[PDB]
Every structure is written in structure tokens, then in C-alpha cells.
Amino acid sequence: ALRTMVDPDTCTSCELCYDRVPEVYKNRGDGIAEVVSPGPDGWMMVPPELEQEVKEVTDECPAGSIITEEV
Numbered sequence: 682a683l684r685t686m687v688d689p690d691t692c693t694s695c696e697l698c699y700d701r702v703p704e705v706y707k708n709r710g711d712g713i714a715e716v717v718s719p720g721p722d723g724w725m726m727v728p729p730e731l732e733q734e735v736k737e738v739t740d741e742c743p744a745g746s747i748i749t750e751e752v
């Protein structure tokens with residue numbers, strides 16, 4: 682399975698992730714991105730149909746703010 686998170690410390694509010702994959706990411710309110718449904722650890726589990734999309738925006742994030750991993 683795949684999970685993902687956003688590091689708000691480095692996010693530059695470029696809007697790519699939550700424009701491209703609104704299923705996974707959203708504007709938290711001030712331009713910075715956050716996953717839509719995070720756990721207490723902040724991680725969001727990704728639906729299998731959205732894995733490749735998530736993996737793509739992870740590579741495309743200009744600030745390397747999106748952390749994604751296989752679990």
C-alpha cells in the first residue's frame with residue numbers, strides 16, 4: 682500500500698498537488714498543501730487507483746515537500 686504526507690515547512694504553495702490530485706491533497710487555507718485525510722502521524726493512506734498520480738506529484742513537487750512511501 683501507499684501513504685503520503687506534506688511537509689508544511691518546505692511547501693511553497695505552488696498549488697500543483699491539490700490542483701492535480703484533489704482526492705489526496707488540499708489547500709489547507711493559506712496556500713500550503715496538506716493531505717485531505719491524515720492520521721495522528723499526519724500520513725494519509727492512498728487509494729490504489731490514485732497511487733501513480735500521487736507518485737507523479739511527489740516527483741513533481743518543486744520543494745520536495747511531499748513524502749510518499751510504500752507500506
Ligand code: SF4
Nearest residue numbers: 692693695696698742
Ligand atoms: S506540490 Fe509541493 S510545493 Fe506545490 S503545493 Fe503541493 S506540497 Fe506545496
